[PDB]
Amino acid sequence: MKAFILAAGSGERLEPITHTRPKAFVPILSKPLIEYQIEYLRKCGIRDITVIVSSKNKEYFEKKLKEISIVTQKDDIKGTGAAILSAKFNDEALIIYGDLFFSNEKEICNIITLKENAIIGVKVSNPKDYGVLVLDNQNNLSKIIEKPEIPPSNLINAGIYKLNSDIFTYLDKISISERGELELTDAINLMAKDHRVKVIEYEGYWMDIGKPWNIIDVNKWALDNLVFSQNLGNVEDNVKIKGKVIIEEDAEIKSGTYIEGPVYIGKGSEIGPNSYLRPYTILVEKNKIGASVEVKESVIMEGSKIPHLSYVGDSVIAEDVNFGAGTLIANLRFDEKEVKVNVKGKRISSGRRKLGAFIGGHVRTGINVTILPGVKIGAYARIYPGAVVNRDVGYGEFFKV
Numbered sequence: 001m002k003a004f005i006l007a008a009g010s011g012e013r014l015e016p017i018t019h020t021r022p023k024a025f026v027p028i029l030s031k032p033l034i035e036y037q038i039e040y041l042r043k044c045g046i047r048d049i050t051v052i053v054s055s056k057n058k059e060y061f062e063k064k065l066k067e068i069s070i071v072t073q074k075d076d077i078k079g080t081g082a083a084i085l086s087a088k089f090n091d092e093a094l095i096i097y098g099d100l101f102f103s104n105e106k107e108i109c110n111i112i113t114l115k116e117n118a119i120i121g122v123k124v125s126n127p128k129d130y131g132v133l134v135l136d137n138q139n140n141l142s143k144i145i146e147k148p149e150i151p152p153s154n155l156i157n158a159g160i161y162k163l164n165s166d167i168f169t170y171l172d173k174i175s176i177s178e179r180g181e182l183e184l185t186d187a188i189n190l191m192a193k194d195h196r197v198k199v200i201e202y203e204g205y206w207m208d209i210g211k212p213w214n215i216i217d218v219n220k221w222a223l224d225n226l227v228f229s230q231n232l233g234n235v236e237d238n239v240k241i242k243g244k245v246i247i248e249e250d251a252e253i254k255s256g257t258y259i260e261g262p263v264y265i266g267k268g269s270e271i272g273p274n275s276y277l278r279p280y281t282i283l284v285e286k287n288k289i290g291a292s293v294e295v296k297e298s299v300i301m302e303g304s305k306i307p308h309l310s311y312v313g314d315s316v317i318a319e320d321v322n323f324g325a326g327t328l329i330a331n332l333r334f335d336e337k338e339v340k341v342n343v344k345g346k347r348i349s350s351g352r353r354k355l356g357a358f359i360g361g362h363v364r365t366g367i368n369v370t371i372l373p374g375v376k377i378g379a380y381a382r383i384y385p386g387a388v389v390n391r392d393v394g395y396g397e398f399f400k401v
Ligand SMILES: Cc1cn([C@H]2C[C@H](O)[C@@H](COP(=O)(O)OP(=O)(O)OP(=O)(O)O)O2)c(=O)[nH]c1=O
Pocket: 006, 007, 008, 009, 010, 011, 012, 013, 014, 023, 052, 073, 077, 078, 079, 080, 082, 083, 097, 098, 099, 181, 210, 344
């Protein structure tokens, strides 16, 4: 059985994280998204895995994934439909979207046993975003309704398919279309008139990593569900630990440090002295958290350092970031309203009263920097000491005012 991961999306809604990595390499605790997917696939006896990527990202994928075929999507076309056109199979294949996290492989294991075309649907609370699944009387797929702005059903396209080579006959009939785009669900929509498409309801945890605060969402779920309290590191005297704490190998936790779990402390991390890690602190790898630094409900990616006199709450900080002493992130607005975030040029409500900042890779802040709620700082940005970052900062930009 072959599998294809469609990982050639533009990842613009996930900026600034995607300034320096594909969405497929977003960390959930210590491992990137795609590594969970490959793991699940392999667990179900699928070893011939192909990732379809943008040409821009081919190099990045080749360098990270040794036993996986990488194929580039045709340059001149876009969409989930265009991605499968580089998928080479006869006979059938498992197809999965490259930004999906889900809790287990059980459904993939089941779906590959089936002769029929099959799709997984999952119930959301915001179906109007998302492809809604309309079932017929026999509970097979009637049609997929794309972003209706009306809820016919809870049940939406989970982006996990087992499709037969049919699917290409229908991709050729497809006229595409109102987004400038070749859409897989359009082809599926034709095919389901002629062929039976089973729908299997996914029951566990599912989430697409679409927007930056979803990085916090999934990492919080993973910490609660996938790992157990352990200490493989070095914890000095007078460190207080409550609740579930994962201390990975080579992590060092100095005296005066206070930890209220659940907290994930990635390998090679250096904590303290006199740090405060609050619930849902996730330090992916090789992180430094120093004296009079408090972290709460944040994901702080590989090699990033917050060495002095800082508060980081409800935030995502990408890799190799350095915070000057006294850099502070606000997570609550003066008017205490839902924090809005600029996402692909639209002002989007995050759904969160408390939300901090989203910091791209290799950013450095000068001392005493102030960052407002919902702010995005582009990768490689440099923030002048004492600056008040009251708006988004572009990729690679110096910011003073
Ligand atoms: C998954 C996938 C998406 N796409 C395209 C179709 C759309 O233009 C866009 C939407 O996919 P989405 O899953 O909606 O998210 P995204 O990362 O791809 O896009 P965005 O910039 O909005 O964050 O990406 C591909 O070209 N190839 C692919 O393999």
